[PDB]
Each structure stands twice: as C-alpha cells, then as structure tokens.
C-alpha cells in the first residue's frame, strides 16, 4: 500500500525529506511499517523547513489531522508532531496551537469517543498552554453524550485528564452534571463511570495534593465537594451495595481527609442494616471500612447493634454473631471487629477520642466468650482459625 518509489525490490537510505517532499505522507502514516519509520524520523535533527512541512502535513489540514488522529498508527505521529510544535517557539507557534485547538474543538465528542483520537485529546490537554487547553474543556458535550464519554472504556480517560490538569473553574459543570441524580445513577452503575466519579472526588478533596491551591480555589473546591457529596449520600444505599460503586463508598468512609462524611455515610444507610449488609458480596467491604474508621462514639453504636441490636431467631436461638461468624461474607466483618478490639487493648490503636478503652474491653470480652464457646464449630473454617489465633497471640502479649 506504500508508494512504489519508496518500496524495495522500504529502502534503506529513505530520508524524512523524501517523504515530506513527495506529498505521500498520509500513505506512510497509516501503514504500520511507514508510520514506524516516520515515528523515528521526526525524533532526529529537523531543519526549520522540515518542521514547517510536518506542521502543515500532520496538524495543518483538519481532514488529514482527523484521519491520522483516528488511526491505529497515525495517532502516534500526531502526538509526536504536536509535541514538536509545542517545542518550537518560532513565529508560527501561536498560530499553530490556535489552529490545533479549533481542529480538536470542532470534533470534540467524536474524537473523545474514538479509541485512538482520545489519546490525542489527552496529550493536548496536558501539554498545550493552559489557556489553550481550557478552551478544549468548553468543547465538551453537556447532554447524554457526556454520559457516553464517562462510561466508555477509552473516552472516560479524557474526563480524567481534564480533572487532573485543568483548574476546577473550567470543568465545574462536569461536577454539577455528575451530581444530577439520574446522571449519578447511570454513571455510578458503570465500571468506567465509577472511575470518573472516584477521580473527581479525589481532586475535590482538601488533601496533601491540594495545599498549593489559593483560598478562592479551595473555596470553589469545597463548594463542588458539598454538591457532589450531597448527591452521593442520597444514593448511599444504592452505591454501597453496587458491584462497582461500593469502592467509592469505601474511599469516602476510609479517607482521612473526608472524615466529616464518615458519620453521614454510616447513619444514612449502614446503621440499623449492619447484619443485612454484612451478608452481601459488595456491601460487606463497606461495613468493614466503616468499622475500621468510624469515630469512637459511632463505633460503639455499630458494635452494640451486632451484639445487642437484633432479636435472635425464634426457633434456633441464632443471633447476629451466630449468623455472621459462619456466613461467607459476614465472617470478614467479625474478623474486622475482633482485629479492632485486639489492636485497642494491645496499644496499636488509640482508644481515646471519654476514654473508650473499657468499651473495647467489653467488646473483646464478648467476642472472646463467643469464640471460646463455639471453638469446635469455628475450628472447621479458616475464618474461625484466624479468630482463635488472633485471640491466642493476644494472651501471649
């Protein structure tokens, strides 16, 4: 498919200038062998005219730029030429970057949803001058196509790149779009949509990676976090039990810099539902994270619910501990409760937040007494073996 003047009975002394002068660059850039050569050729020594030809033939013609950006091989050359254009501070630098934004902006949604063109979008978002990259964010769709971008395996990384390298003032509309209850439901029910929400939450958190923000930027960040968190906690039960969004609830509940939302999550959808949620494949991990990071006043309510919150079965006498200890998912919650109590009485976890040290001793004594009485049944399972050994190493220390 390559032109015959370059073919070998590709040659060996084929230079980049031969390809640029010939006008056949589009044929090489879509062929695997040809584009691999162009990949290496543009890394060598380029004269000013050679850069000029590359700037016109690769990122100067909209239709050719689109064809190469959506190409399996050609998209690599576009990213390389964009880098050379951004690295060449000649008199055409401004005109080239302005034209490149218009090329991308005019086909934002189609390029975003494309497997290879979305790589060109991500490269431009993080490499172009910040003033020009913000103009790309304005070209993002605001309707259902934005949802299609967030739930696409490839397009979702464009939004992730926007979140990572663009100031929040330019993509605050994405937060409000995701915060819309119907949009949050559809996005957080998708494995890739959850990755978008997770990245946005991390960016909107006042953690160590955001101390460089100004006061105005921090205030804008806190406003967007409250609007998204409000919509998140209203679907708290749906997200905590979802196969993908349960990781998001785990993060909100475990992240230290989101501690004020720990209380909101636990009381809204976890309290008075610990036994049921502990028996779910996905919600049990959230229950684990809640026990591990709950404030001591709320941890007490959680422990009392497992120990004394449920009426035992009227026929057998099974209580909540009897059910969770031998459930395929609930046993991990009990192991977590035991580990928490063992860490407290051993000095590994601070008990003092009143001093809840005596509270941890009551729960440990409850767990120790039950594990002692059920040691034979528990010794059949790996979880019971862990619990018995967990209590065993404590008595030695």
């Amino acid at each position: 498919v390559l032109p015959t003047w370059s073919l070998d009975s590709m040659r060996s002394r084929l230079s980049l200038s031969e390809v640029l002068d010939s006008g056949d660059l589009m044929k090489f850039a879509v062929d695997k062998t040809g584009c691999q050569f162009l990949e290496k050729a543009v890394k060598g020594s380029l004269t000013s005219y050679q850069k000029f030809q590359l700037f016109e033939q690769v990122i100067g013609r909209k239709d050719d730029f689109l064809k190469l950006s959506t190409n399996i091989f050609g998209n690599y050359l576009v990213q390389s030429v964009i880098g050379i254009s951004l690295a060449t501070n000649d008199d055409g630098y401004t005109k080239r970057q302005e034209k490149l934004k218009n090329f991308i902006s005019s086909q934002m949604t189609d390029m975003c949803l494309d497997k290879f063109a979305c790589r060109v979008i991500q490269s431009s978002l993080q490499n172009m001058d910040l003033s020009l990259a913000c103009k790309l964010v304005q070209a993002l769709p605001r309707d259902a196509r934005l949802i299609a971008i967030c739930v696409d395996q490839n397009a979702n990384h464009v939004i992730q790149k926007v979140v990572a390298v663009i100031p929040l003032k330019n993509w605050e509309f994405i937060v409000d779009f995701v915060a819309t209850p119907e949009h949050l439901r559809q996005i957080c029910s998708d494995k890739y949509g959850c990755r978008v929400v997770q990245t946005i939450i991390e960016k909107l958190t006042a953690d160590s990676m955001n101390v460089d923000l100004t006061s105005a930027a921090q205030n804008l960040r806190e406003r967007a976090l409250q609007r998204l968190m409000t919509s998140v906690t209203n679907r708290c039960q749906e997200l905590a039990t979802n196969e993908y969004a349960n990781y998001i609830i785990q993060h909100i509940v475990s992240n230290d810099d989101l501690a004020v939302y720990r209380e909101c999550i636990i009381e809204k959808c976890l309290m008075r539902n610990l036994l049921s949620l502990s028996q779910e494949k996905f919600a049990s991990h959230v229950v684990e994270k809640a026990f591990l990071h709950a404030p001591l006043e709320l941890l007490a309510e959680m422990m009392d619910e497992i120990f004394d919150g449920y009426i035992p079965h009227p026929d057998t006498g099974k209580d909540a501990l009897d059910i969770m200890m031998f459930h395929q998912f609930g046993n991990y919650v009990v192991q977590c409760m035991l580990t928490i109590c063992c860490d407290a009485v051993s000095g590994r976890r601070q008990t003092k937040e009143y001093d809840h040290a005596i509270s941890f001793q009551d729960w440990l004594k409850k767990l120790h007494s039950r594990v002692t009485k059920e040691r034979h049944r528990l010794s059949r399972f790996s979880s019971g073996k862990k619990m018995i050994e967990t209590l065993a190493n404590l008595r030695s220390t």
Partner: peptide, 11 residues
Amino acid sequence: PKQLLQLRSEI
C-alpha cells in the same frame, strides 16, 4: 442466601 433478624427498638 440471607439470614435476616428482626431489629430491636431505639426508644
């Protein structure tokens, strides 16, 4: 399968 138990009161 799930083994659910009736809750107690909070008063």
